[PDB]
Design a protein around this nucleic acid. Structure first.
Ligand SMILES: [Ca+2]
Ligand SMILES: [Ca+2]
Lengths: 133, 95, 314, 111
DNA sequence: CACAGTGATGCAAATCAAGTGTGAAGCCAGACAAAAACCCG
DNA sequence: CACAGTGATACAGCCCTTAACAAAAACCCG
């Protein structure tokens, strides 16, 4: 789902192929090419306008939220501390684990370890400081 | 000694931008009809989208079109009527 | 007509003016196009006397949270005579149209109400109250006070609700913390003082009439209604050898300072039910008329003594 | 529709002696119908016919519902207007286009 | 088949985080078309 | 000297514009 070219476009494309084949290592500047087609369009266009138009019928066949308030928001949870403390472990042990699969792994790890005090009591103290501040 | 643009007061900023003001107003009422505010917010939205801040541009369009963070008088009238508010109670609520 | 087309064309129209503004910004501020355009548009709005839109713009350029805390929403909902249904209607309308929450939902207000209502602040009487529980979390105690409603017992045909007298006094005193603090600060008194404050309260009781009875199931209640309220009048402190009037009600006859205490549905001339309902209140009153209250507001435990007066009786 | 309202207290101050009654008068649209092709079809019918949100008030006065003289003296202009409008057509602009209207009056909200 | 509310009480649905690295829709240098609505021809 | 409302009207108050002057708060240099 995107756009298409035109008659004028599929001769600039041939010029693009030309100046990309004359030196396929310096396709960095556009100003030179901007002053290149000025002479190429000042003959040898019908055979290209044909393939340009050939894409005419072809191409025709294809929330408001908050705005940075103050930040007494969402104190971290026990599972959040577990993640923040054990994701880099598996990351350095296995870098290929995107946090979708890595988070599934960390979760099934948390879903096997029995419940506590370093997580839940700390989260409760954080929530207590949260309600006050 | 120069400090910064927005650090000045309103009159001082006007004194400092009177030249650009005259230039923009004349070059806008020569050919573009004469709606200064139109050209102003158009140029501001363009310069803001140059920084691809779609959110800020959408919020400004909502403000200048009356559709968010501010009610048109008909809507607040309907609120004041259909909720049986008085004229003094709504005033207190609006004050 | 400009300001109505799409892009890539209004640019092509204003390209000259845009490059001129760019040159001006490079000459003046080196390329601070955003700030200079913002200032120009603000002054353009101010020229046409459109202060509202300009203020909204300069406020949103910060991007800030214009949300009301639930206390303000509760104050608006109470002091403007709004039912919960109409408030919810207004709430959903504003949220759906403005796409944000200027007001708070109902549950937030409900949760905030539990602070102003009695039975939320701790307190204790240094002389224990005779025949009065020392628990300090009771809310709306039933008015019948556990009256026997059996078929053999004297019949009961009245309903009533009310608070605990001492809890009501504690809540009323905690409601006027800022006023007492400002009175002490204005009368050239240190705020951390905890002298034996003296409080005078005016009581009142009247019997209403023509109150329509409702349908449904329950006891056959009469139509005459009776209420009973009080009002904190004046407070003094014993500083040295004087009595400084730290606070006095400026409108002792206004409905905004007559706090309720008890409600019932019975005749005023019905001497049996009237006494059967008002006995616990008089008991608590006579009990606390020989004690002193202490509580900590502003981080300092204070001392209170009551001197009641009953005058609002026809 | 029309009805008399009792128990309407009188205020102090200046003015004529106002009786302690009240009489209202209101109307309500029911169904709009266009003649398309060879038959008729409705366009907008009232979903809630007895709702208060569609009872448009027209006339208000403080008089007895049995004071026949005053009642007729107040309601005769409205009846004259109704009789004059029962044989006319209205031109009205809706969305920038003139429209044609003709009415059929029916009075049923009378006890 | 009057009806627009009255309250609390309860349950169901959205969210929301804090972690995280990749993917994606504008924006730019000119600039000759690609139509397209005006003049009247 | 009950007292909080109650909707419309008038007027003060407080923003806006142009136009040259005129005073106030600072940094290079002597
Ligand atoms: Ca009475
Ligand atoms: Ca009647």
């Amino acid at each position: 789902p995107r756009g298409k070219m035109s008659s004028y476009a599929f001769f600039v494309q041939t010029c693009r192929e030309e100046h990309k084949k004359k030196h396929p290592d310096a396709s960095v500047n556009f100003s030179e090419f901007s002053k290149k087609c000025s002479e190429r369009w000042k003959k040898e266009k019908g055979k290209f306008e044909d393939m340009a138009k050939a894409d005419k019928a072809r191409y025709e066949r294809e929330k408001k939220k908050f705005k940075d308030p103050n930040a007494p928001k969402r104190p971290p949870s026990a599972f959040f501390l577990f993640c923040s403390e054990y994701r880099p472990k598996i990351k350095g042990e296995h870098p290929g684990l995107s946090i979708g699969d890595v988070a599934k792994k960390l979760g099934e790890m948390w879903n096997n370890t029995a419940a506590k005090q370093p997580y839940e009591k700390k989260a409760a103290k954080l929530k207590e400081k949260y309600e006050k501040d | 000694p120069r400090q910064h643009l927005l650090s000045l007061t309103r009159r001082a900023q006007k004194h400092r931008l009177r030249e650009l003001k005259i230039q923009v107003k004349e070059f806008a009422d020569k050919e573009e009809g004469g709606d200064v505010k139109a050209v102003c917010l158009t140029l501001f939205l363009l310069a803001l989208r140059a920084r691809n801040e779609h959110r800020q541009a959408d919020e400004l369009e909502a403000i200048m079109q009356g559709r968010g963070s501010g009610l048109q008088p008909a809507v607040c009238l309907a609120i004041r009527v259909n909720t049986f508010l008085s004229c003094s109670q709504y005033h207190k609520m609006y004050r | 007509h400009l300001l109505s087309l799409t892009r890539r064309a209004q640019k092509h129209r204003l390209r000259e003016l845009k490059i001129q503004v760019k040159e001006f910004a490079d000459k003046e501020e080196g390329g601070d196009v955003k700030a200079v355009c913002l200032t120009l548009f603000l002054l353009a709005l101010r020229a046409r006397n459109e202060h509202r839109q300009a203020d909204e713009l300069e406020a949103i350029m910060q991007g800030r949270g214009s949300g009301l805390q639930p206390a303000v929403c509760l104050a608006i909902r109470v002091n403007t005579f709004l039912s919960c249904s109409q408030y919810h209607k207004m709430y959903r309308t504003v949220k759906a149209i403005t796409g944000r929450q200027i007001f708070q939902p109902l549950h937030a207000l409900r949760n905030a109400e539990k602070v102003l209502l009695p039975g939320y602040h701790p307190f204790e009487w240094q002389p224990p109250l005779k025949n009065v529980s020392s628990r300090t979390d009771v809310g709306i105690i039933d008015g019948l006070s556990g009256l026997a409603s059996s078929v053999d017992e004297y019949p009961v045909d009245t309903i009533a609700k009310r608070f605990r007298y001492d809890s009501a006094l504690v809540s009323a005193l905690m409601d006027m913390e800022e006023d007492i603090l400002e009175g002490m600060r204005s009368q050239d008194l240190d705020d951390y003082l905890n002298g034996p404050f003296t409080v005078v309260v005016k009581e009142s009781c009247d019997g209403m009439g023509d109150v329509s009875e409702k349908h449904g199931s329950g006891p056959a209640v009469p139509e005459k209604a009776v209420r009973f309220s009080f009002t904190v009048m004046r407070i003094t402190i014993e500083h040295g050898s004087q009595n400084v009037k730290v606070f006095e009600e400026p409108k002792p006859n206004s409905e905004l300072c007559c706090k309720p205490l008890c409600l019932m549905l019975a005749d005023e001339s019905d001497h049996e039910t009237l006494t059967a309902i008002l006995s616990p209140l008089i008991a608590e009153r006579e009990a606390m008329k020989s004690s002193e209250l202490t509580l900590e507001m502003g981080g300092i435990p204070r001392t209170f003594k009551f001197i009641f007066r009953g005058t609002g009786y026809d």
